[PDB]
Amino acid sequence: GKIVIIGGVAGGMSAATRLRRLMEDAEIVVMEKGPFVSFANCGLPYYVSGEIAEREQLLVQTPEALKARFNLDVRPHHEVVAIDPIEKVITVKHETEILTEHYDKLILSPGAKPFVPPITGLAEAKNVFSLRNVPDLDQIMTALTPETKRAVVIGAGFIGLEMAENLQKRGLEVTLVEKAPHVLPPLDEEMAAFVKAELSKNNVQVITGQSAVAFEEEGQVIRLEDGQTLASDLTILSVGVQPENTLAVEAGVATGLRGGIVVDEHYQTNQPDIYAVGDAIVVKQQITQEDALISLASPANRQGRQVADVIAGLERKNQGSIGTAIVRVFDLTAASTGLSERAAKAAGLTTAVVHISGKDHAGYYPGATDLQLKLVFHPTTGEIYGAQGIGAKGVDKRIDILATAIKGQLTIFDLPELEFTYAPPFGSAKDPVNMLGYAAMNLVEGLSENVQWYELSNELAKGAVLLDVRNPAFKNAVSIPLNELRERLEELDKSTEYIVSCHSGLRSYIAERMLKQAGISAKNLDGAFALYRMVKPEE
Amino acid sequence: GKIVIIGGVAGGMSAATRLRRLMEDAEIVVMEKGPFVSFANCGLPYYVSGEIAEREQLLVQTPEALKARFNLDVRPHHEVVAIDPIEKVITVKHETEILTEHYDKLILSPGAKPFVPPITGLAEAKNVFSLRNVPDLDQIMTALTPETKRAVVIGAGFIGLEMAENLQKRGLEVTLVEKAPHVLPPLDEEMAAFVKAELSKNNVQVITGQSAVAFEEEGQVIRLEDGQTLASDLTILSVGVQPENTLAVEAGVATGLRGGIVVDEHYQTNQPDIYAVGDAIVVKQQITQEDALISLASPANRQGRQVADVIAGLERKNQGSIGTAIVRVFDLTAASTGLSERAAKAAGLTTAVVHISGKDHAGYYPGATDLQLKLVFHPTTGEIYGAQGIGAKGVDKRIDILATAIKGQLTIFDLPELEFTYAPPFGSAKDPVNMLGYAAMNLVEGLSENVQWYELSNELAKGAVLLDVRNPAQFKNAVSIPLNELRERLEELDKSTEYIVSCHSGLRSYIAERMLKQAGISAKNLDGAFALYRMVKP
Ligand SMILES: Cc1cc2nc3c(=O)[nH]c(=O)nc-3n(C[C@H](O)[C@H](O)[C@H](O)COP(=O)(O)OP(=O)(O)OC[C@H]3O[C@@H](n4cnc5c(N)ncnc54)[C@H](O)[C@@H]3O)c2cc1C
Ligand SMILES: Cc1cc2nc3c(=O)[nH]c(=O)nc-3n(C[C@H](O)[C@H](O)[C@H](O)COP(=O)(O)OP(=O)(O)OC[C@H]3O[C@@H](n4cnc5c(N)ncnc54)[C@H](O)[C@@H]3O)c2cc1C
Ligand SMILES: Nc1ncnc2c1ncn2[C@@H]1O[C@H](COP(=O)(O)OP(=O)(O)O)[C@@H](OP(=O)(O)O)[C@H]1O
Ligand SMILES: Nc1ncnc2c1ncn2[C@@H]1O[C@H](COP(=O)(O)OP(=O)(O)O)[C@@H](OP(=O)(O)O)[C@H]1O
C-alpha cells in the first residue's frame, strides 16, 4: 500500500516511476538527503569543462513535473537515520526536524559513498573534494578561481580519467595519481598503455604505482609513498566507492562482499518487506556465477524497474550483471566488458587471449582509424570471459556487440557467424569482431600458437629467436620480409624455436603458418611490435 | 591436392587465401573473367562521387603481392565456360585460347548478375548502365562529362540509394524510380518514409509505385506507365541481382530458389568434389529455417573461409544467415536485420511490433540526435524476428547489437538485461535497445495494448476515440487532455468508451494508457504516436 524509497536517483527513481505505472493508487514516498532527485550526476565532470554549458541541463526532471506526471511524494533534504524493521518505521532528519514515517514496503537504493583514503592531514586540507553530486560541484566550482593553476586527480579509474580530461580542458595543469601499476585498473596493462600515451600526448602527468600518504601545507602539497611531492591548487578524490550500508547495518540488514547489501532472486534483503537495488547491493557476476560489485547506471536502472515489478506481484528475477564500462580520453575511447585477463585469472578461470588491430571501417574509404581489441576466452571451450577495446572510433559499438554475445552465451566459434551492418562508411566485410573469433579459433584448434608481450623476454632468454618479417621500409633478430620468406625459408635453422612478429599480428600469423608446415617451430607474437613497443618501450 | 576456384572476389578469394594458410603444398588456381581479383566493388558508388579519390584505392591487393604473399595462381580474363564433373576438367576461354584445367576440388563462387528488366529500347539505349565491376565503371565514366546534368536511378534498394546519393554529390539532378510503393522495399512503409523525407530534403526526386515502360531516343527519354516522361543523361539500373548459375546448370549442378545453387551443410553441391559459396548459393534464413538469397559481403566472406576449412578436413558447418543491411542517405542512416513486419507476415509468422523514438546518447550532453527503432517479435514467446533503425547516428550500433541478439536467440525478455557502454557521450543508462525490450514486455504481459498506424482508422471508425495528451503548446474528432492534467481531469472521459492515446512519442501516451487502464477505462496506445503517423499518413 505505502512504499518508501531511500535514495532518489538511478535505482530509487526507476523503481518509483515504474511503481506508479503499475499501481495508480499506491502511496510512494522518495527520501533524498540531497537537494535534487533525478539529477544527471554522470554529467557533472562535463559541466566542469563547460561541455555542458548550463547547470539546469543536468536536472533531468524537476520535482514539479514528477508530481504532475507520476504523482510522487518526493522529499529532498530528507536523510533517513534509522530503520525499525519490526515496527516498520524509519526515522528521518529534515533540517531541524526529526520525523517518523511508517512503511509497508521499503526499497533501499542509497548507492555508494566515496572511499575515505588513508591520507594524513585530510581534515586540515582545504582544496580536497569529491565530485558525486551537486553539493560537491558547488564546492568545486567555488574553488576554481583564475588563480588556480594546478590540479591533481587521485585515482585513475574510468571516472578518474573523466575528471582529469575535463580539468585539462579548463586550462589547468593536471596530474593523475594511481595506486595501481597503470591507469584504468579495470583494463589490462598493455591496453591501458594506449591510454597513458594519450594522456601524455595531452600534457597530463601520470604517476603510477605510488599512493598518496599525506596532505601537507593545508593541501597545497601532496606527499607520495616514495617521498615525491606534488603541488596542487585543487585535488579531486576519485579513489573508488564502497556501498553506503551504514543505515542497513544499523537496521540488521545483512551484508556480504565488500560490505554490499545481500539480496535474493527477488531483490529482497534478510528483513521482512525491505528490498535493495543499485550500487549498494551485491550482484551476481554472470560470467563466474560469483558475487561481485558492479557500480554502474545501467544495472541500477534495470534493478529499480524490476524490484517494482516484484513488489507489484509480477514474476521478475534478479539475474545479475557482467559489467560494461567506457570512457573518452581526449581523442581516444577505452571500453571493456566482462572480465579482464587479470581478473579472469584471479577468479580461478582458465584463460587465453588474442589481440586484434583493425579499422573502424574499410581502409579504402576515407577517415578510417585504428582499432585495438582484446578477447579473453577459455582455451578449449571458447567461452568468452571479457573483451577490451581502444580506438578513436567504433569502440563503443564493438564492445557493446561483444557484451551482447556474452549475454547470449556465444563462444569464439560463433563470432565469425555474426552479421553486422557492413557498408564502406560503417565497417568491413570481416569486422574486427569477426576477426577476434577467427584468430581465437586458430589458437583453440592448434593452427596458431602465440606468445604474450610479458613472455617475450623470457622466451628469447631461453633460446628462442625473433623472426622479423616486416618489409625493409630488435637486436639479435633475423629479418626476412614476408614477401621473400617462402623462397628464403631455407636460411632458417630447423632446430631453433622462432617467434614471428610484424607491425600487426596478421602478417606474422601468415608467416607462422609457412614455418609450421615447413617443420620449423614458430609462434606468433600476439599484438606484434605495435603492442610491444607501447607497453615495453625499453626492452 | 589441386583446388580450382571460379570467381575471384569475396567468396572465391576468401577461400583461396584461407586454403593456402591451411595447405602450403596445395596448388590453388583462381579463375576470374574480369581484369582484377580482390577489387573493392562495394566502394564503386563512392568513387563516382569522388569520396574515393583514386581508383587504385579500390584494388585491395595487387596481382604481384598475391603471388608473393600466398603463392596463388590467379588468372584474370579467364572465363570458365564448361564443367565436366566426371572427367574433373573445366573449359576456359582466355582471349583467343580455349584451355582445359583439371581439378581435384572445385569451388563455385561466380556471384550474381543484374536482373535485366523488360523495358523497351534497352539494347539501343546508350546512357543506361549497371555498376557492379570495373568494366561497368569504365562505361559509366564516359557518361560523367561536364555536359551531364540529369541522372535517373531505377530501383530504390540499398544499392540504388547509394547510387543516387553519390550521383547527387557529383552535382547532377537525380531522380529515383522504384516499382514498389516506397523506397527501400526491405524496410516497412513507416520506416522508409524517413528516408524519402531525407531524399526530398536534398533535392532528389522520388517516383514510387511506377515502372519504366521504354527507353526512347537512345535513352535520353524514359517513359513511365503513367505516361510521364523523364529526361536523362545517365541511367543506372539497380533493380536487384540474380544468381550467376548458367555454368552450374550446364554441368548438372542442382539449383533451387531463384536459380541459386543448392549446397549441403558442408557447402557441397550434388556433384562430387564441387562446392559453392557466395551470392550464387541458396542459404538458410535462420529466423524461418527456409531457403533464401542473402547477397551480402559478410556471409560471402565467411562462407569462403569455411569451405576452405571443409576442403582441408576441418569440421565446419554451413549454418545460414539472417541478413543485415545498412545505407547512408546524406545525413541519415537506415539499417535493418532479420525480417521486416511485412516479410515476417508473408512467411506465416505470428508477429507483433513496437516503435521506439530515442537519442543516440544522453540528451543533456550536446549533439544528441533522434533515433527511430522498430522491433518485430513473437507476441507470446518474445522471439525476435527483425529490427529496423533510422537516424543520423547510432543506428549501425543498435542494429548490430540486435543482430547479435538474434544470433544468440535472445528474446525481448533479455533485451532489458543487456549492458551497453554507457557514458553521456555514448549512450543512455536505459539504451533505446533496452527500451525496445521494456515496451515489448508490457505488450506480451498485457500491461499495454497498442494500435498500429495502419489500424487506427478502422479502430476509430468502429467507435474508438483518439485521446491526444500533447501539451497544448492536430487530429480531428480528438479529445485533448494534456498528460500533466489527465490525472485530475480523468473524470471527463466516458468509461463506456474505448480510447486510443497518442502524443508526439509513445512514451507519454503509454503513461496515460496506464492511468486509464487502472481507472477501469478501455485504452490502447498508438504505436509511434503522432510523430510516426504524420510521416506515413500525412
Ligand atoms: C561523477 C560520476 C560519473 C559517473 N559516470 C558514470 C558513467 O559514465 N556510466 C555509468 O554507468 N555510471 C556512471 N556513474 C555511476 C552511476 O552514477 C551509479 O552507478 C548509479 O548512480 C548508482 O545508482 P544508485 O541509485 O545505486 O545510487 P546513486 O545514484 O548514488 O543514488 C543514491 C542516492 O541515495 C541518497 N541517499 C543515501 N543515503 C541516504 C539516506 N540515508 N537518506 C536519504 N537519501 C540517501 C544519496 O544522496 C543519493 O542521491 C558515475 C557516477 C559519478 C558520481
Ligand atoms: C556496387 C556494389 C555495392 C555493394 N555494396 C554492398 C554493401 O554495402 N554491403 C554488402 O554487404 N554488400 C554489398 N555489395 C554486395 C557484395 O559485393 C556481394 O555480396 C559479394 O561481392 C558477393 O561475393 P561473390 O564472390 O559471391 O560474388 P562477386 O563478388 O560478384 O564475385 C564473383 C566473381 O566471379 C566472376 N565470375 C563469374 N562467372 C565466372 C566464370 N564463368 N568464369 C570466371 N569468373 C567468373 C565474376 O566476374 C566476379 O568477379 C555490393 C555490391 C556491389 C556491386
Ligand atoms: N592480429 C592478428 N593475429 C592473428 N591472426 C590474425 C590477426 N589479424 C588477422 N588475423 C588472421 O589473418 C587473416 C586475416 O583475414 P583477411 O580476410 O583480412 O585477409 P586475407 O585476404 O589475407 O585472407 C585471418 O586468418 P584465418 O582466415 O586463417 O583465420 C585472421 O584470422
Ligand atoms: N515509444 C514507447 N512506447 C511505449 N512505451 C515506451 C516508449 N518509450 C518508452 N516507453 C516506456 O516508458 C518508460 C520509459 O522509462 P524511462 O526510464 O525513460 O523514464 P521514467 O523515469 O518515466 O521511468 C518505460 O516504461 P516501463 O518501465 O513501464 O516499461 C518504457 O517501457
Author numbering:
A (entry chain B): 1 to 473, 480 to 545
B (entry chain A): 1 to 473, 479 to 543
Task: Give verbatim excerpts from the published study on this entry.
Additionally, CstR regulates coaP, which encodes the coenzyme A (CoA) persulfide (CoASSH) reductase (CoAPR), which reduces CoASSH to the free thiol and H2S. The biogenesis of H2S by CoAPR combined with its specificity toward CoASSH over other low molecular weight (LMW) persulfides implies that RSS, specifically CoASSH, confers a greater physiological impact relative to H2S in this organism. The enzyme responsible for clearing toxic CoASSH in E. faecalis is CoA persulfide reductase (CoAPR), the structure and molecular dynamics analysis of which revealed a catalytic mechanism that is consistent with its persulfidation status in cells. The N-terminal CoA disulfide reductase (CDR) domain consists of residues 1–446 and harbors the first catalytically active thiol, C42, while the C-terminal sulfurtransferase (rhodanese) domain is composed of residues 447–544 and contains the second catalytically required cysteine, C508, which is persulfidated in cells.
